Write a protein that binds this ligand. Structure first.
Ligand SMILES: Cc1cc2nc3c(=O)[nH]c(=O)nc-3n(C[C@H](O)[C@H](O)[C@H](O)COP(=O)(O)OP(=O)(O)OC[C@H]3O[C@@H](n4cnc5c(N)ncnc54)[C@H](O)[C@@H]3O)c2cc1C
Ligand SMILES: Cc1cc2nc3c(=O)[nH]c(=O)nc-3n(C[C@H](O)[C@H](O)[C@H](O)COP(=O)(O)OP(=O)(O)OC[C@H]3O[C@@H](n4cnc5c(N)ncnc54)[C@H](O)[C@@H]3O)c2cc1C
Ligand SMILES: N[C@@H](Cc1c[nH]c2cc(F)ccc12)C(=O)O
Ligand SMILES: N[C@@H](Cc1c[nH]c2cc(F)ccc12)C(=O)O
Ligand SMILES: [Mg+2]
Ligand SMILES: [Mg+2]
Lengths: 417, 415
């Protein structure tokens, strides 16, 4: 009827890579593959848009590194997606604290054996006081570094893996790339190749409950026009992040692993101008990291600028945008002036602008060394979970590519046995 | 967030017209007004696309009559919206059964005084065979007429108010019009007036709960990107349909009125082609009502064709799409061939195609001592909808209900 052998819920890069693997193995010749996604287009947190029509921007995932993301780089190669160089790898304008930051971290490196499981701010508060730790951490631009569930070990890692601040650790030799046409180009390639292998896509449907009926599973979905729908399937991968797994009858996270999980919100806003005015200030391809709310300001060539924030500072912008769009634009203009040491009259007004708020932008495992495998399995019901958070690269596309490969392994095992 | 004096939840023609009647008023001078809608664009069940860059199509409301719907044509003239003759007012290619229509319907009409509360299929199967009543009703193309909820008296009014079949009950006097640019032109016109007069819009936000708090109310809303949000207002209109009303925590329909409410699903599917092939059949600006699942088939000049079903048939099609767009387009093209009396291989395949399904397309009145807008027994929230009027299911109903709810809300402002 309305049934399938294998069903993947989730059409981000995790899901579509689980689809890509299964299709090639001849363990799946003549088997039926259905992919469901709650949105109307695949990608998940990869989301490329044409702004004004003149340029290509990344509302979600933006950059990758061949050092840290070789499986992603191989993917971009395999689908003939052309990469470009990502300029935002040094701060031209290192302030006094950003100066001190570099040395100030090679030196507490030892004490991470002793107290490295403290919070990152608890940790640094011992070098100088609370008030110097904050100035140091603020100066790095990523507010998540102030959370309590961010260990001081997790923190030395995060800054080593971000292009704008990597120079502060011994990860300063990592190259970074973005997509020419945008990562959605990769997503389309995988989609198209999975489609021609005969997987069937039902985009715009959202899973609500799962129950076992004997040899298989029985899914309750609700389309986005209200249409309820049910689907009998023999094998199921839930290619969706932990935050999404919480909202079902699958007893998550208890039936799946020992871990608890968390997430942070992220906010990006982009602005386009008539004239590229930041060229006078020699600013194309530069990143300021500031103490004001924009926190990280980027000038892409002569094309546009954008900023990028997280945690409390992402909620703050999602609040401001809710209070109407003209006060949001006027706060941006104010803070662009502070970062450039000028007065707001010399900042034009924009033509166009877009913004994106991700409630659960990065999801991450809260327990280090609890022995976390790439994909999870429901101990009772035998469902496979698959997400970047279940990996060493929580919060990276690479973590999706690796959870998917494991997740497609444990599936095939369930078939051939 | 912050607050507002007046809050309207809903940006269809009801809510947008409420906003209009209020900002027109001198009693609202100075007062702040906030509008919320869960969709990103205003309109509700008015949606106009412009598909294949060559024509404006209507995925919801598509026609009005100056005779049946006077306020709507006033609103059309009021906002300087051009109209055009709606072509589909008769059947050029009737079958055998749909001339027995006018002569059996206008002959079974004296019997309506004795069996008025009876459902329509019970009725017309008393004065003809059952399989002869199933052939006669289904010849009219609206599958809502096979339902116990809809009575034999409430059925003669649907037949005379719809332009494809109104000939069947002496009402060809009525004329039918569509918008030249589609009805979103109206919706944009009102919207610009209400924005120019200082109301602040918040689209993409969806109301989940209300709670009173003295002189005013506190509303829980959720953005479509997850962003939860809290808003306090002093006066509040819920300009949403009753299906939406039941989805909240506000004792509906109990604390509001002694009426029940149902709904019917609707489905429309549009198809555009490289060459306008149906001309070779003299089918342009024509409509065929057919037995097969397409039910009502429309040919817009030489630009596109579409088909329009309701009730179960609407659910037939929604299910078909759900099992893949390929099963659906080949289904359409099979039934298209059976309707024209030709082979499948002569129906070309379409370039572009769009469709919409309305889980609650029409919301109607279960009853008749009925006011045009509801008030809460206790809290004073006002509900506004086409479903509370003599015109259950027309844009006209939303205009009438809007007027009513403005006046109740102004009475609650003054005095
Ligand atoms: C602002 C931002 C910037 C980023 N920058 C980078 C970067 O530069 N480099 C990098 O490597 N990573 C980056 N990431 C992270 C990267 O985007 C993700 O890790 C990767 O896209 C996740 O792949 P995924 O398939 O596991 O998750 P997702 O993309 O979240 O896929 C989830 C999919 O499942 C669907 N879905 C969910 N739930 C349900 C349900 N209950 N029923 C049905 N369907 C459902 C969703 O619609 C979604 O399509 C960034 C993320 C954000 C938010
Ligand atoms: C297929 C179809 C064809 C039609 N053809 C015609 C025709 O030819 N002539 C005619 O007169 N009428 C026609 N109609 C009916 C016409 O569209 C409606 O009568 C009218 O548009 C409804 O107006 P409304 O403003 O009361 O509500 P709606 O148009 O339903 O708007 C309700 C609004 O409330 C919003 N909403 C709901 N719930 C919530 C919540 N919890 N939080 C926030 N926001 C919310 C919705 O987004 C929506 O914008 C047709 C309808 C359909 C479905
Ligand atoms: N890597 C993403 C964001 C990100 C990934 N992991 C984390 C962890 C964190 F604490 C903040 C942001 C992030 C980016 O910047 O493009
Ligand atoms: N007949 C209208 C809408 C409508 C109003 N009431 C009803 C009842 C019904 F059974 C079908 C449609 C309708 C149309 O052209 O779409
Ligand atoms: Mg996925
Ligand atoms: Mg409305």
């Amino acid at each position: 009827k309305h049934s399938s052998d294998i069903c993947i819920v989730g059409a981000g890069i995790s899901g579509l890579t689980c689809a890509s693997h299964l299709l090639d193995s001849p363990a799946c010749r003549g088997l039926s593959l259905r992919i469901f996604d709650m949105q109307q287009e695949a990608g998940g947190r990869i989301r490329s848009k044409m702004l004004d029509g003149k340029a290509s921007i990344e509302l979600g995932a933006g950059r990758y590194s061949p050092q840290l993301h070789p499986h992603f780089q191989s993917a971009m190669q395999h689908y003939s997606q052309k990469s470009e160089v990502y300029p935002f790898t040094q701060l031209k304008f290192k302030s006094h604290v950003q100066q001190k930051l570099k040395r100030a971290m090679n030196e507490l490196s030892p004490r991470l054996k002793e107290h490295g499981k403290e919070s990152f701010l608890q940790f640094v508060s011992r070098y100088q006081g609370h008030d110097s730790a904050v100035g140091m951490i603020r100066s790095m631009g990523y507010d998540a570094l102030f959370l309590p569930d961010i260990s001081a070990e997790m923190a030395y890692d995060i800054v080593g893996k971000h292009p704008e601040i990597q120079s502060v650790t011994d990860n300063d030799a990592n190259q970074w790339f973005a997509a020419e046409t945008g990562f959605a180009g990769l997503i389309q390639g995988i989609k198209a190749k999975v489609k021609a292998a005969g997987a069937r896509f039902s985009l715009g449907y959202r899973l609500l409950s799962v129950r076992t009926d004997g040899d298989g599973y029985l899914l309750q979905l609700a389309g986005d026009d209200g249409w309820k729908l049910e689907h009998r399937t023999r094998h199921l991968i839930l290619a969706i992040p932990p935050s999404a797994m919480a909202g079902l009858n699958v007893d998550f996270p208890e039936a799946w692993s020992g871990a608890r999980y968390g997430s942070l919100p992220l906010f990006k806003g982009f602005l386009t101008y008539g004239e590229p005015w930041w060229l006078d200030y020699k600013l194309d391809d530069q990143v300021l990291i500031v103490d004001n709310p924009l926190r990280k300001i980027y000038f892409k060539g002569d094309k546009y600028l954008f900023f990028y924030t997280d945690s409390e500072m992402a909620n703050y912008w999602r609040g401001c945008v809710a209070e109407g769009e003209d006060g949001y634009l006027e706060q941006i203009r104010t803070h662009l002036a502070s970062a450039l040491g000028i007065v707001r009259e010399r900042i034009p007004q924009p033509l166009a602008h877009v913004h994106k708020y991700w409630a659960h932008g990065v999801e991450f495992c809260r327990d280090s060394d609890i022995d976390h495998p790439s994909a999870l399995s429901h101990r009772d019901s035998g469902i496979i979970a698959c997400s970047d958070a279940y990996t060493e690269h929580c919060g990276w596309m690479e973590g999706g590519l690796l959870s998917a490969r494991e997740a497609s392994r444990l599936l095939l095992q369930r078939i051939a046995a």
